[PDB]
Amino acid sequence: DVSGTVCLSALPPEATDTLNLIASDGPFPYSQDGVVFQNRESVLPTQSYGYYHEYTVITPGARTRGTRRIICGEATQEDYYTGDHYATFSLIDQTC
């Protein structure tokens, strides 16, 4: 399940950066950005393979990719934010 919706302005600024990179099709800082997200645990709604893709949301000061990500769905404005390494997700509202 998805936890609820969160305004983009309420997430860390790096989330805004990732969405802008997604809009321009990169380039992305990490080679893992843009791979398919399999939704193996069925946390997000069931969709065909490849409907979801994952992108890094940089964690300031981290040596690794960290735990923040944006998962896009194929639908218009369907983007989910996770700050706990895919445990929970919120839908991002880019209008607020």
* DSSP secondary structure, 47-59, as one string: --TTS-EEEE-PP
How was this one solved?
X-ray
User: Catalytic amino acids?
Assistant: 54, 85
Q: Nearest-CA neighbor of 38 among 23, 53, 18, 56?
A: 53
Query: Which residues on adjacent β-strands are paired with residue 79?
Result: 72
CATH of the domain at 1: 3.10.450.30
Q: What angle do CA 2, 87, 24 make, to 5 degrees?
A: 70
| Closest C-alpha to 50, from 21, 26, 73, 22 | 73
Q: What is the number of domains present in the chain?
A: 1
Domain membership of residue 6 as a residue range:
1-96
